[PDB]
Each structure stands twice: as C-alpha cells, then as structure tokens.
Amino acid sequence: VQHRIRITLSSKSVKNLEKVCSDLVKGAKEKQLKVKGPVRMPTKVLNITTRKSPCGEGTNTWDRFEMRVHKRVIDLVSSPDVVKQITSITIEPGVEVEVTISD
Amino acid sequence: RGGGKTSQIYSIRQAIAKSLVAYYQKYVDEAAKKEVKEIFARYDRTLLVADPRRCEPKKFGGRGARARFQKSYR
Amino acid sequence: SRVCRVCGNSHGLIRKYGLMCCRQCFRSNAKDIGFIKYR
Amino acid sequence: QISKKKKFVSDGVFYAELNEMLTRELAEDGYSGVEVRVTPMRTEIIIRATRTQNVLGEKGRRIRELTSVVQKRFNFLENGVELYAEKVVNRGLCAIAQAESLRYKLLGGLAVRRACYGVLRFVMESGAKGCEVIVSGKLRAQRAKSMKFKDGYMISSGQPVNEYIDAAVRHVLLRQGVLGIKVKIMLDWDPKGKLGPTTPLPDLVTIHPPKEE
Amino acid sequence: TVKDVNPHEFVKAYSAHLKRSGKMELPEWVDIVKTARFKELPPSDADWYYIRAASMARKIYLRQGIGIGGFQKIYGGRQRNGSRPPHFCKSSGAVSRNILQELQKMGIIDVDPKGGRLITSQGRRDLDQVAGTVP
Amino acid sequence: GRVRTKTVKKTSRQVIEKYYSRMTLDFHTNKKVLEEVSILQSKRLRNKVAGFTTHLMRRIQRGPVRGISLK
Amino acid sequence: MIISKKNRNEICKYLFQEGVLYAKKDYNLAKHPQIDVPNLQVIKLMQSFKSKEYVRETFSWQHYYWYLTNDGIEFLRNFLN
RNA sequence: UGACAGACUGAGAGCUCUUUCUUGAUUCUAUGGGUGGUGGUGCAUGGCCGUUCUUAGUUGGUGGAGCGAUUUGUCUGGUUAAUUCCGUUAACGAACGAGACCUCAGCCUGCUAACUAGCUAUGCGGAGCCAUCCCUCCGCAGCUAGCUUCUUAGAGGGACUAUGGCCGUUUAGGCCACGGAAGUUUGAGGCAAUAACAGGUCUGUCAUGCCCUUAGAUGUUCUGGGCCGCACGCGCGCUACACUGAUGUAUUCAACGAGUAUAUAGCCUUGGCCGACAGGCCCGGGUAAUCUUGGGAAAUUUCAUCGUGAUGGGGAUAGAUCAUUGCAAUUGUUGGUCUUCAACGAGGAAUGCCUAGUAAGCGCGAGUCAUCAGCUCGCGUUGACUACGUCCCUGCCCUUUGUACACACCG
Ligand SMILES: [Mg+2]
Ligand SMILES: [Mg+2]
Ligand SMILES: [Mg+2]
Ligand SMILES: [Mg+2]
Ligand SMILES: [Mg+2]
Ligand SMILES: [Mg+2]
Ligand SMILES: [Mg+2]
Ligand SMILES: [Mg+2]
Ligand SMILES: [Mg+2]
Ligand SMILES: [Mg+2]
Ligand SMILES: [Mg+2]
Ligand SMILES: [Mg+2]
Ligand SMILES: [Mg+2]
Ligand SMILES: [Mg+2]
Ligand SMILES: [Mg+2]
Ligand SMILES: [Mg+2]
Ligand SMILES: [Zn+2]
C-alpha cells in the first residue's frame, strides 16, 4: 500500500535550500509519514581560473570563480497520491525538486 | 585512513594516547587519569593535542605556497 | 570548428562544463551566469 | 539526460542570454531585469521594466511575439514558458534603467552636465544613500577626459559592495567616439526587504534606549 | 597468522613454497621481459616469478576483486622519461596474467562474482599455514 | 596590532554610558548583555566590543573616566 | 539571390502562421530548425524585408531576430490569402 | 540558372570552351548607397586589465590665515599592520581608503540527520589455533542500535588580548606567563580609494570615430607552404654531474578535482581474454559520496646488485621496426622495442625567490585536447637551516630643508 518514494533536491543557495528542505520535512511530519532525512550530500564546487586581462600583458593575474552546488535528499515512505497531497506548497527561489519513484 | 606515512605514525601516537586518556577518565578514575596525562604532557604535549598546521593554498604567479617565479629585468 | 556562444571568436575558449565562451566573454557575463567569486 | 553541473551551467547561460537579448529588444521600454521561475507544468520569464503597456504593445501583442521567439529559439514545449512583465517598484534604484535613461537623454542632444544631474537629483530624492556617475570619452574635445558626478554616501570595497551597490555600464553611440557611462547607486537598508536589502551594513550600531519601569 | 608476521618474510617463505609444494606450468618467455614498460632491465632475481606470485597471492589474500588492470596499477611505478619530468607508468599486464592463471590452476585463487579475483577457501588454508611456519 | 577602531571604541563609550548597572565585569556576561541591548552583524565585532567595555568597566569601577556621562 | 517560389512560400506561410522568425549566424547548416532552408536564404530574404522595413530586426548577438510588422502583414496578406 | 562527354586545372569547382537541354522575371546591367574586413590608428575612444602603490593615502561643507596660488582641518609627542587610536588642538563636523565585510583551513565525543556515507554488536559463513567451545584476521545480510567517533554539511558555539605580571602620561597600548585547538588580526586569500599612465588591447566582441578596401576584394571559401626555417645573443624551465646514489625485487599511504545521445556502449573507464610492449576483442557501470576510485601516486621504506670508473651517473644525437589519434603524421604527433651513450667533474662576472607545513624534494588532477604538458592553474606527501633584526644597498610613507627643475634630476 505505502510505497517508497525519494525526493532529490539541490540549488545554489544555502539559506534557500535549507528553507525548502525544512518546509518539505515539516510537511511530512504533519502527515506523520515515515520520513528519513534530509541527508546532506557533499557540495560540488565548479571552479574556473581565468586570466583576468583581456589582452595579455602586465602581471599575470588570474581570477577564480566557484559555483557551489548543494545536494540533498529525503526518503519518504508514502503513496504518490500522498506525495502530491504534500509537495504542492510554495517552493522557495532557486531550489530544484525532482521526486523519483524508487524500488 | 588517509594522510601520508609519517602523518599516519603521528596520528597513531595521538590516537593511542587520546584513547588511553579517554578510557581511563571514563572507566578507571579522573584522579587516576591525572597521572597519565601528567606523564604524557610531561614527555611532550603533542601526543594529546592535534597540530593545527595544514598545507596552505598556492598563489598564482609562482609555483609554491610562499615562493614566486624567478624574476628577470632584462 | 567551435566558437563562442557570445562573440564568435575561436581563440581562448572555456570549453569545460560546456560554456562555449571565450575567456573574455566569460568574464563579461561571469557573475550573471552564476560564477559568484568568493575567491 | 544531463548532469547537474551541466544543468546549472546551461540554466545560467539561458539566464544570461535572456538578460542580454531582452536589452536590444526592451531598450526603449526601460528594462531592469528578468527573473526565471520554475513551476509545476510551467516555466516563467519575469521581465521587469519601467513602462508596461508599451512593452505589451496593443492588447498584449509584443509579449506574444517575445514568447513565441523564446519558445522557438530555445525549443520549449508549447505553452511551456510564459512571460509576465511587471514594474520595478522603485525607479531611482535600478541602475540599469537610470543608465539607459542617461543614454537616451545624452543621445537626443541634451547637454552632458544637464543630463547627469537629471539622473543624479532623481536618484537623491528617490531614497538612495548615494550615487556616482562617470562619463568617459570625447565630449566637446578630441583628447579623452572623464567626468565624475556625485551625491551622498558610497562604498567601494569589502563584501557589502555586492549587497548595496547597484552598478551599471553602458556604451553610447554619439558620432565621433563612444561615451562610456558608469552609474553606481547606493541602496538603503529596508528590513522588510521591499526596497533595499534586508541585512544592514556591517558598520551600524543601534544602542536601544533603557525602557524604564 | 599472515597479518601477524612481517610483510617480507611471508613472501620469502611463500616464494619457496609454490616452488617446492609440487610444481606447475610456466610459459617460456619468463626470462626475457622487463615486467614493466618503464623498467630498464629484467629482474635481477632468478626466482623472480615466484616472488611475483607470492606477493600477488597476499594481495588477493587481503583484498577481493583485484583485476588484470588493478594488478598493472599496483605494480607500476616511476618512469623517468629522459630529460622530460618523470611520471607514473603502469606495469605490464601479461606478466600478471600468467601469475593469475598459475594460482588459478593451483586453486590458490579464482575468478570472483561481481568481477575480480577472490582467494579460494583452501588457498586461504595454504597461505595461513605457510605464514604460521615463520619466526 | 590589536588597537580597536573608532566604531568599537565609540560603541563602547555609548553603550556603557547608556547602560551601566546592567553590565558587569565578567566578560562572558557582557557578550549576551550586549546581544540583547544592541543589534550587530558580526559576532567577532560583538566580542571585540565586549572585550573593551570590560576593562572600561574595570577602570570606571575604581576611579573616574572620560567622556561618558553617568548619573 | 536565386530562390524558388516554393522556398518563398514555405517562409511566407511560416511567418503568417507564427509572426516571429529566428535565424542563427552559424552558416551552411542546410536545415534551420522549424523550416527547411540552409540559412542563407532565410537570413537574406528577411534582410530584404528589413530593407523594405516589413520586419523589425534585433540582431541580438548573431541570432537574427525578425519581428514581423503590421506594415508587413498587409504585404503577406496581399501575397498568400 | 545548373549541367553530361574532354582539354584546362591537383581538383568528382561546368570557372573558361565544343554541345544545346534545363529553370523562369528569383535577376544581369548601369546610376547611389549599403554590407564585410585578424585592414590602419590603443596617439581619436569605450570597456577591462596592469602599473604608479601592498604602501596608507585622498576630498568637499562651515570657520580661521593669505591680495594670491594655496593653506588649516589631515597635528607637536606616544602607540599602531595602518590618516589605527590616545591626545594636542582655529578648528568643528562629516565622506571614501584602512578596520569592519566574504571565502577556504584549524576546534567541538555538544545539536539536526544520514544504508549514495560508516563504524559498533550480534547471527552465521572461511582460515588458523588446549580444537569442543573460545581467541585472532576475514566475507554476507538485517526491526541491531537508548548508533554518528570516523565521512558529509547545516545551524551554532569558540578568541576578546579575557586573566596575571612588568613597562606605559599607568590613556591608546606593548612585552611576558597559565589556560585554550587557536594569543604575528589565528593562517591564507577575495574585495580594495582620489588622481593618473599618452601603460596594454581596434588581433575578444553585429564595442567603436576617422581613414583605406568594396568583385580583377585586405571580403569569404578551398589546396598546399608558412608561423617550427638557423652563424649567433638573451629570458622562464626540464634533466644531471652520483653512493645522502642508480638499477632490480618486496612493502603501502593522499587530496584536489574530471567524466555533452558521446549511436547503435558512447566521455571516464571496471572485469575477462589476446598481446613481451604498444595496444586490441568481449559483456558491462556511472549524468555520479552510487560507476570509474573507499583514487593501491611517487619521493620515502627494507632485500640485493653496482664500489669512485664520463661507471650500470647523465640520456642528448641517430638507425631500424610496430601501434594508437586523426581525411591526412612529411620538417620525425605521440607511445613502445632494440641499438647509438654525445656534452656535463657543483659551475665566471653577476643575479632570483624565500621566515613555517614555509623553501626544497615528490607525484596527481585541471585548462589547453581528435592525439601532443618540459607550461600555467590547483591538490596532497616528506619537510628543514637561518633570522624575530637594521637603514648598509634597492625602494615606499610622513616631517623639516634647498632648488635656476615642472614632459619635474632620464630636469
Ligand atoms: Mg594607451
Ligand atoms: Mg582604453
Ligand atoms: Mg574658506
Ligand atoms: Mg577670506
Ligand atoms: Mg576650508
Ligand atoms: Mg589575514
Ligand atoms: Mg611562434
Ligand atoms: Mg614566466
Ligand atoms: Mg627503488
Ligand atoms: Mg642511466
Ligand atoms: Mg633584486
Ligand atoms: Mg592534460
Ligand atoms: Mg644653495
Ligand atoms: Mg637659497
Ligand atoms: Mg620652469
Ligand atoms: Mg644628470
Ligand atoms: Zn567570446
């Protein structure tokens, strides 16, 4: 009856992601789901080094950019009709949600 | 796990010392543990306390954390 | 046979992650694509 | 299927390609920014500008052409991405629109010193802790010389530059050169978040008075 | 047993072990090769092939799923490229292979489910007792 | 190299003027006192201020002192 | 330029059905998406619609955005309809 | 307008011709104007960057002094990394810069959790053993946790010179000592002011004025060469001159990061087989803490072998051959195999960087990339000598001082 569903969630912003995950989590606790998370996953740090000159003279000075991508997952023991009963509330900016039906 | 070779020796020393003092403090006695800490900290202090020193990032304009490319005027 | 998505220049690209920009167009659009420069 | 790194990079490139293309289109409408929102069964492009019925055209036509060209260019499922085009609550703070206004005022033939303070006193009255303008190029003389115009406070270093300075760069196509226009505008602290940012500058202290009982 | 003894004399005992504990086949190119591209000379050892076997035997003893390429990798080394900077070069694989078919035809090890080579329950017996017979 | 700057020193004078009997000498009390009688945006500035008002208290609690006005 | 009635028509249909048109600068594809053309013909006939100001053109970094005008809808309405 | 047969031309470019079919107002011609240019001018400009300048410096409002340019504020002293502060005070009050701010790293047996991470215990399973059970190392799965130390990352906490001492106008502070992970601001960076320079870039841009070119083109495309040619000088580096070493076994330990439908397995590549090597064939895994890879890195560590010898140090030069990438390897792409074994004996005048996980030694990843990393950007491993000062040299900041200099002593 009660299936096993997973929620895959990632963003660019610490605060904003932490707000979205807690929203889903307290949603789950209001409906007394068997919920397990939010497990935190190591942050993937895209980096670039670029010679900040546009012509190539002067002191060789580079600049480093870094996009951090923060990975989070939650496990829910529910039916997908309950999943769409829950996960329709506001989603805060920039955060991304890709629910997956697992084994 | 991890580290190098001598780094692992220096972790083993630390973890033996720190597990000894934790085990005595929780299961033998505080006062009886005091003699152990005072012997160890008498020999040295780095048995018990980690070393804050790490490898610090290398800055552009020279291979080396604190070095630079060789400089030529002519 | 590969140029910028931006200025159509075939020197100094940044092909990693599929940016397909040159090193200067990437600085010019750097912080709006999202390469926030903490360091 | 694509990795998440590529996912985020391609979404960023989409944001930038809009942020740029929407400028040549919405130059004569007072463009200020675009926000992209991902919803269930829909994707949204939030054009924000200063004049809304002329970006709508007559009876919402111009937005129709723009949504069609975005659909087509980025190969979106039809009805996939839709446009709202709202109005920036305050106009003296979004440095893009102020720089563009200086651009048209300066193109039309209006004097440079008149044009810059026409921007500057507007920015001052409209609640900004300071403003700077730099005009650089060949104005009334061949040899290049750059004019700075100021009013009020301004920060230049450290982190809060990003949270307080709305800064723009524009190029102008006056005959016989190009005028560069830098517009820097200081924002003011609104804890509400409506008008200026939420967290105040790292050098401000509020010693509360001693309520008595 | 095996972990309880010095990591060298176990190999020194075991190299003579699968010399004298019966015998087996051995391809007829053992004597020419360098056993790794970056090397410079054939091994000085006369019974180098048996020591190769003993070392790989304890590798498989204390790990599961070690491959034809993993054995290449764990036996490669530093390659001075000439005036070029030195680098890492994987060892040669066909030397490791016939060691694996020797230990397999002896039943010391065998191919693994999920890939690799796992110690055999009786090969475990062989290595444990030969290690027990060390100082 | 540990000279406190003008922001720290004048928050020190102003807060210890404006609130005297509600601060003490023990450092760690003062931190939280100031956390509830002031709004700041850097816990290191917060400790930096408390560490100076504490010996301002030490000097006042023995003798007299400059600008601050206490009733 | 050398173009067929057929190619003119398959663009004229498409503009009267959509209203916008998008090219790319990458040249010699032989297939612009959403129509059948090698991108010379589209870019250049739309250029000529620009010269006769039937379409407004915002070049937008080598992507050729052409927005039909109501000046040009009468032309196309007098061509195919 | 496109073309079949041949010359032409390398050219299966119908460019040009013999040959006349084909298409139909899409043109061609001529008159303007466009368009395009890695064309010129960085000395017409934007923009961005570098530098002056890594230092601590700069500017209005009101007031004072001066006919005036200008000066005061911005300072006599003390303190500081600091125009940082105490304070003095014709100054008063304010703005940038400094500091504050941001990031990474260091600490937490405290909190939230986590079978994509991982101990721990029990159950079995293998192997050794006073063996019958146990004790030790191993593999497998769990309604094992009143699991989260290890791993990840969120929120926080922590350090302020707080305590003590001495010096100090007992002010700003400084030196010392317990404590603490941390007492050069804890370390390292990011950002970084006014005024500039005739600093760099029109060769980053459908950024750009002017000028030159616009078909017999500085446009664009194609074929080939060229940027790589070597008497010779200079610059950053790579490899060495050995024995504190080379070669050959054995032993075993990171972190950064990286991985397009890539089509009929396809970037990273596991396992199996073929192969001395290069490299091949097969079934696979991963859009990733899941598969590669819990990255089995070298230096280092032991066991021998060489024994002061241009030797087995050193590996340039060249010969012969195979293989992979590429439509294409020639002026050797690269990698192997075998052979050749060149100069180099610690380096002249001079000169570079460097004060603790630092120099130095060592490898790895990334960019570039169809293949080419002696480079550049990051990551870890081993890991020190000396110094804690000074103005002697080379400079920067401030004050007094002299100037016949001001494109400013390169006067
Ligand atoms: Mg110049
Ligand atoms: Mg310029
Ligand atoms: Mg005056
Ligand atoms: Mg006067
Ligand atoms: Mg004045
Ligand atoms: Mg620092
Ligand atoms: Mg060259
Ligand atoms: Mg260099
Ligand atoms: Mg060796
Ligand atoms: Mg040699
Ligand atoms: Mg020097
Ligand atoms: Mg590479
Ligand atoms: Mg004189
Ligand atoms: Mg005189
Ligand atoms: Mg003069
Ligand atoms: Mg002279
Ligand atoms: Zn570009």
Alpha-carbon distance of D14 to C2, in angstroms, equals 19
Contact present, A56 and A19 (Cβ < 8 Å): no
Q: Would you state the structure tokens that stand for residue G58, as one six-digit string? A: 């915002």
Experimentally determined by: cryo-EM
Alpha helix segments (H runs only) across A1-101: 14-30, 80-86
- The verdict on whether omega for the bond into residue A38 sits within 30 degrees of 0, i.e. cis, is yes
Breaks after residues in chain A, judged by C–N over 2.5 Å:
none
Cα G18 from Cα D180, distance rounded (Å) = 38
Which of C17, C29, C34 is nearest residue D6 as measured by Cβ atoms?
C17
Q: Does C19 contact chain D (CB < 8 Å)?
A: yes
Distance from C-alpha of G56 to C-alpha of G63, rounded to nearest angstrom: 14
Give B65 Cα–ligand 12 centroid separation in angstroms: 22
Tokens of F6: 């003008």
- DSSP string over G27-53: ---S--TTS---SHHHHHHHHHHHHTT
DSSP-derived pairing of the beta strands A100-101 and A4-11: antiparallel
- CA atoms lying within 13 Å on the CB side of residue D38: 11
Which segments of chain A are extended strands (E)? 4-11, 34-51, 62-77, 96-97, 100-101
Tokens for E124, please give them: 């475990």
> For residue A19, what are its two tokens?
């707000």
| Contact assessment for residue D38 and residue D76, using Cβ atoms and an 8 Å cutoff | no
Neighbours of chain B (3+ CB pairs under 8 A): A
Dihedrals φ, ψ of E111, to 5°? Answer: -60, 145
- Residue D110 (CA) to nucleotide H187 (C1'), in angstroms, measures 55
Comparing alpha-carbon positions, the chain F residue that sits nearest to D204 is F40
Give the nucleotide nearest to G41 (CA→C1'): H26
Q: CA B71 from chain center: how many Å?
A: 36
Spatial distance between the Cα atoms of A45 and A65, rounded to a whole number of angstroms: 10
Are the C-beta atoms of A96 and A24 separated by less than 8 Å? no
In sign, the C-alpha dihedral spanning G8, G13, G17, G23 is negative
Q: Give the three-state DSSP class for F62.
A: coil
Q: What gap in Å lies between CA E6 and CA E11, rounded to an integer? A: 9
**C-alpha to C-alpha distances, A38 to A34, A82, A92, nearest whole angstrom:** 13, 19, 17
Q: Which residue of G has its CA nearest to D69?
A: G20
Which D residues 146-205 touch F at CB under 8 Å?
199-205
Rounded to a whole number of angstroms, the CA Rg of chain G reads 12
3-state helix, strand, coil in chain G (%, to 5): 40, 15, 45
Please state, in angstroms and rounded to a whole number, the distance separating the CA atoms of residues D198 and D187: 11
Q: CA–C1' span, D111 to H352, in Å?
A: 56
Is the alpha carbon torsion for E6, E12, E18, E22 positive or negative?
A: negative
Query: SS3 for chain D, per residue?
Result: CCCHHHHHHHHHHHHHHHHHHHHHHCHHHCEEEEEEEEECCEEEEEEEECCCHHHHCCCCCHHHHHHHHHHHHHCCCCCCEEEEEEECCCCCCCHHHHHHHHHHHHHHCCCHHHHHHHHHHHHHHCCCCEEEEEEEECCCCCCCEEEEEEEECCCCCCCHHHHHEEEEEEEECCCCCCEEEEEEEECCCCCCCCCCCCCCCCCCCCCCCCCCC
| N- to C-terminal Cα separation, chain D | 67
Q: Which ligand is nearest to the CA of E80?
A: 10
| Burial class (CB within 10 angstroms; exposed 0-12, middle 13-18, buried 19+) of D120 | buried
C-alpha–C-alpha distance, residues E104 and E64, integer Å: 14
CA distance F68 to F8: 15
Q: How far is the CA of A58 from the C1' of H199 (A)?
A: 9
Residue D10 in tokens: 């391609």
Note whether D25 contacts G58, CB cutoff 8 Å: yes
Cα separation of F68 and F21, whole Å? Answer: 14
Residues preceding gaps in chain B (C to N > 2.5 Å): none
Cβ neighbours, 10 Å, residue B18: 15
Interface size A-B, in CB pairs within 8 Å, comes to 7
Chain G interface residues (partner C, CB cutoff 8 A): 25, 61-62
CB D26 within 8 A of CB G67: no
